[PDB]
Design a protein around this ligand. Structure first.
Ligand SMILES: Cc1cc2nc3c(=O)[nH]c(=O)nc-3n(C[C@H](O)[C@H](O)[C@H](O)COP(=O)(O)OP(=O)(O)OC[C@H]3O[C@@H](n4cnc5c(N)ncnc54)[C@H](O)[C@@H]3O)c2cc1C
Length: 340
């Protein structure tokens, strides 16, 4: 079974088995079967954040558990969504149905169940801001476990499901809390050109869609997992010393006084834009997005990643990490040790 449709990169590799879970109980029966046969199981929404390095020795379960539930409270509308729901259709549905708050995360691919895992970020907002609780099943017990926004252990590009719980729990619904008083987040990019007294939810959504659709590579033409690396977050001291010699590295102040450096700039300083290693290439405008340009195989993407990490690491002593998840033959592997 070919994973090449279950992969936004377009890399053709095979899993021993592929199955579409339309519901919770079917997801559990499939998992209990594969694991009783000694197989690794891998849950998946749209493949938009994985890199399949070998052919997979187990069952992939495509999670299509659909369903939106709106609930009105005095303070906020609480949405209860299914893990199989598409995230950008959810962003246009809440903005069509009178519910602002999600526009800055528009056109991120993947499924709603994915978004607590990597804590999807864009244009200032991260999922954490509108995430009330997450519903997941303990796959080895049948057991529904509802974790709340605190117990999720959210961080920049991080959650509990990225390490303690990944192969234990399966997300089946997400609880979003959208407040009735909309604070517009006009903090990154061309959204800074927007006056907060004239700004409508729909035009925020509009600005973000144009930025994305013009700067980022469409998976239909160029295979990718979007921004291959996470924007480094350095401490104010380590930042200050870098800004004394490079004084406009485009950096953002994080909530705790830490500094986010733009990885798109650093790579571009290293004159890496356009670099093809095999059929994999550094995207020319968006230098953080490694693409599948000309029939790229996994080694091409791992070797160009290692090289982009190594040249940015020499010129600036800022050691980059991949956001994309690396999958070996029998499960997930450390993305950094593979590209170091
Ligand atoms: C062009 C492009 C732009 C992108 N922009 C962004 C962005 O702005 N911000 C951002 O954060 N990401 C971005 N991404 C990456 C991606 O969209 C997100 O990381 C997203 O959360 C992945 O969607 P997915 O459902 O396809 O995840 P998948 O790749 O299918 O899965 C990701 C990981 O989560 C697990 N997982 C997936 N669904 C479940 C579930 N129900 N239960 C348990 N585990 C599950 C998988 O096993 C895997 O480890 C972009 C990708 C592309 C191609």
């Amino acid at each position: 079974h070919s994973l090449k449709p279950w992969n936004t990169f377009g890399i053709d590799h095979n899993a021993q088995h592929i199955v579409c879970a339309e519901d919770e109980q079917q997801l559990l029966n499939a998992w209990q079967y594969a694991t009783a046969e000694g197989q690794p199981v891998l849950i998946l929404g749209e493949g938009s954040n994985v890199l399949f390095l070998e052919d997979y020795r187990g069952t992939v379960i495509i999670n299509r558990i659909k369903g939106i539930e709106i609930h009105d409270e005095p303070d906020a509308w609480y949405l209860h969504v299914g893990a199989g729901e598409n995230w950008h259709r959810l962003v246009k549905y809440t903005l069509q149905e009178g519910m602002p708050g999600l526009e800055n995360l528009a056109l991120i691919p993947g499924c709603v169940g994915s978004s607590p895992i990597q804590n999807i970020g864009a244009y200032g907002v991260e999922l954490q801001r509108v995430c009330a609780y997450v519903d997941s099943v303990e796959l080895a017990t049948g057991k529904q476990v509802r974790l709340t926004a605190k117990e999720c252990r959210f961080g920049y590009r991080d959650s509990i499901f990225k390490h303690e719980y990944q192969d234990r729990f399966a997300i089946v619904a997400v609880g979003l809390r959208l407040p009735k008083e909309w604070q517009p987040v006009l903090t990154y990019g061309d959204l800074t050109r927007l006056d907060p007294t004239t700004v409508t939810p729909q035009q925020v959504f509009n600005a973000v869609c144009h930025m994305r659709t013009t700067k980022l590579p469409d998976p239909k033409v160029n295979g990718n997992a979007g921004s291959f690396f996470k924007n480094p977050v350095v401490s104010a001291e380590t930042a200050k010393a870098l800004l004394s010699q490079f004084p406009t590295a485009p950096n953002y102040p994080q909530a705790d006084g830490s500094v986010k450096l733009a990885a798109g700039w650093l790579i571009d300083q290293c004159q890496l834009k356009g670099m093809q290693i095999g059929g994999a290439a550094v995207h020319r405008q968006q230098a953080l997005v490694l693409i599948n340009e000309d029939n790229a195989k996994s080694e091409d993407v791992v070797q160009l990643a290692h090289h982009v990490r190594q040249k940015v690491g020499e010129k600036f002593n800022v050691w980059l990490e991949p956001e994309v998840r690396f999958i070996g033959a029998s499960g997930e592997v450390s993305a950094v040790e593979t590209i170091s």
